[PDB]
Every structure is written in structure tokens, then in C-alpha cells.
């Protein structure tokens, strides 16, 4: 209940955590959104997740969460989990649907996309890793079948990314949310850590590198890694 | 190549014969069809593996949909059923009487939406799957799989507890949010789990108000139905 002193809401707030690699993976989508609309934002950089305040906001205890003020009426609004505080900024801030979709046909197939990460390659890659530091088996039968499930999860990518034109996941012409939402799960670090060789989908490695040339991108990789380093650990940056 | 009887003059769901395991993700968007009234058809796929069928859903699950753009220029599609009641929502729900009306209701219909499509909907198919389908049995995976499915029934008692909180996103109606959790949250789901019901109170007086809904009474008997009728695949009269 008890709510930190340095937690106010005069502009959207990102929940964070102090991390390194899969750690980070989650809370760099909202981030590279954020970064690609240039929305105003505080970090949160919150010491215990277990803390009572913070499942009043994320009933799941994780990271990236959003706290913001309501499009007026200064109320308080919620996000939870990475895919729901995409879709929360992009309804919030991206109002030309640049990110978001621009009709239905685009909001069909970037929901499509989003959905494919929200319900497969995301929740397989979090049980793949859980099964994977476990190791309570002798022989690696669980990951094994989370791992075969990865690869059939990236065939889907690189089907994609091979039809003509497409250049990103859901739209040819421009990343949305669903590029955003799965790009840290298809990129050549997470194949390497999943044991694959990822130059066997040539077009979804030409895809992650792409993503990551962008700025937006750059700039979240880098805020997200730096998050409690600096000056201010824990709280309010 | 397509099947002859597959043409698009309207929204088609595409289904399997409806058996004990086939329903549980296929009655969602024929729910929210049943709410809205929305015209469609129902295409029973014989096969999934069949290559005109990934064209469509490149994961080769159902539900899908095939559906004419507003502007008429272009078929669109939706697939997994997170998507599809985006998309049922998006074109029929002009009022946002299950999709959201404003910023702050979609914030929470995509939260509880999201919760659904990332952990509940997954744990539940990986228990399904290590449960009865992989050839060895895993007790230490099987077990931590229904251990996860009792914390998200504890995290919609917990909402469900909330004053007033009639539903999972609003208070005051059904919503996605509610129609993607459903099938996974009642009492003959729970007992396929090996699960008392009863433990989360209002839980299952949630489903038993959502139960007697009769779009969700339509959809569940008609789900079934698929397969059985006077034509077994393929365009349904």
C-alpha cells in the first residue's frame, strides 16, 4: 500500500530493475517505443519488486511496469508486462498508429505478429531459460522440446522476412510494436544463448541487425544496460 | 492452392471438428462473433499441416480468420485467438462495448488480455502437452506447470476480490480481457488440471456469470457441433 516518497506521476513512469542481459529483455520494449515516438518519461528504478506497493501496480511482480496520468482528468492509468505497455503507449502517444497500425488491414497483421511473441517465442524462450538453470533432469528432456519449439518459431520469422518486400515482421515498409516486441528474442546473442546458429535464417539476422541500426534502438540498449549504475542506484533517476 | 469451397464474401473462422481438446482457444472469437451478431462462415479445416493453411496461419493452429478490408482493396487475416478478438473487436466494435471505448479502459483490457495470452493460455498448453502428449512423463516440469496455473488463478481471485470488480479488465462488463480467460478459467477446465475450483471463489462465480451469457452458451454448443453437422470439412451452410 505504502507508496515510496520519491514516486510521483507528472509524465509516464517506467518500472525498471537493476540487471544485465535476459534481465533487461522485457523492459527494453516499452523503452525503445518511448525512445522512437520521443514520449516524455521518468525511469523507476524499483529496489524490491516483492514490495507490496509494486503488485498494487504489476499483480505478476515484474518488470517493465508504467505508471501515468490519464489523457486528462488527472487520473492515474496502469501497464504490466511488455506486449500490454506497448499497446498502452502506442494508444496513448502514437496517434498517427506509426507503430501502432493506421487501419485495420495493418492493425490485423500487427496483431498477428505482437500475439505470435506474446504467446509463443516469448512465453517458450522465459521456460526454455527457467528449465535451462533448473537442470533437475540427468538429461535435458524439457528444454529439449523448448528448444525445438524455438527453431520452429524462428522458421516462422524467416518464412515471413523471405516473402517479397516484406522488410519487417508485420508491415513491409516500416517496424511496429510486433518488430519491437521481438526483437530481443531474435536476435544472434539469444540464438547463441538457445545454442543455434543464427546465420541459418539469413533474412531474420538481416531483420535484428536492421532494428538494431536504429537509433531509438541504440538509445534503449544503452539507457537499459546504464538503469541503477549511475549517480542514483534505486528510486527516481 | 485452395480448396474450392474456400471464398471469402465475408469473415470466415476457420475451426477443427470439435472433440474434448479442439474447442478451448477456437470459441473465443465465436463468442465475441455471438455478442456483436457479426455475419461470418466457418470453414472446418481437415488438416492444419496443409500448405494452403499456413498461407493463412504460418504456426498451423486455429483459430483464424479470413475477412475483406472496409475499403475493399485487400483480405486480411487473424490468427491465434488473442489476435482474432483484436481484430473481431477492431472491425465490428465500433462502440468498444468488448474492445474499450478510451485510453484508460484499454489500458486494463489489454493488462488482463495480455496476463492471458503470456502466462495463463501458454502454462496451460505446456501442462496439456508434458501432461498427456510427450512421450515421457516429466513430473518435476508437469508439476511446476500446474504450480504456475494455480498463481494465475490466484492473481485473477485477487482482482476478482477488488470492490466492485464484477470482470477481469472493467467493472462494469465483460470485456477480450474476459473472453480470452474463460475457457481456462471454469470449473471443467480446472478440474482437467486436477484442481478444486471452489478454492478461488470468485473466480467461479465469475465464469458461472460468464457461462450464462448466451452468446458464450451459443458459441460453446455450436464449437462442438463443428464437424459433426451435415458437411464434416470444409465451408459449413
Do not use: C
Not at 79 to 95: F, N, Q, R, V
Request: glycine fraction near 6%; proline fraction near 6%.
Amino acid at each position: 500500500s505504502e507508496r515510496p516518497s520519491d514516486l510521483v506521476v507528472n509524465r509516464l513512469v517506467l518500472f525498471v530493475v537493476k540487471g544485465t542481459a535476459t534481465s533487461t529483455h522485457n523492459t527494453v520494449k516499452p523503452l525503445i517505443l518511448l525512445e522512437e515516438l520521443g514520449v516524455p518519461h521518468d525511469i523507476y528504478v524499483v529496489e524490491k519488486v516483492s514490495a507490496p506497493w509494486f503488485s498494487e501496480i504489476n499483480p505478476h511482480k515484474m518488470v517493465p511496469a508504467i505508471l501515468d496520468r490519464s489523457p486528462d482528468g488527472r487520473d492515474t492509468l496502469r501497464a504490466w508486462a511488455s506486449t500490454s505497455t506497448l499497446m498502452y503507449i502506442a494508444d496513448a502517444y502514437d496517434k498517427d498508429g506509426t507503430f501502432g497500425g493506421r487501419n485495420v488491414q495493418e492493425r490485423s497483421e500487427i496483431n498477428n505478429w505482437l500475439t505470435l511473441h506474446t504467446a509463443a517465442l516469448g512465453p517458450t524462450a522465459k521456460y526454455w531459460l527457467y528449465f535451462y538453470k533448473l537442470h533437475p533432469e540427468k538429461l535435458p528432456k524439457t528444454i529439449e522440446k523448448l528448444r525445438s519449439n524455438i527453431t520452429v518459431q524462428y522458421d516462422i520469422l524467416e518464412r515471413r522476412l523471405n516473402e517479397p518486400g516484406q522488410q519487417y515482421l508485420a508491415l513491409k515498409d516500416r517496424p511496429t510494436i510486433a518488430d519491437i516486441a521481438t526483437l530481443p528474442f531474435a536476435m544472434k546473442s539469444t540464438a547463441e544463448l538457445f545454442g543455434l546458429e543464427f546465420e541459418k535464417w539469413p533474412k531474420l539476422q538481416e531483420w535484428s541487425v536492421r532494428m538494431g541500426e536504429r537509433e531509438a534502438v541504440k538509445r534503449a540498449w544503452q539507457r537499459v544496460a546504464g538503469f541503477g549504475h549511475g549517480e542514483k542506484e534505486y528510486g527516481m533517476l
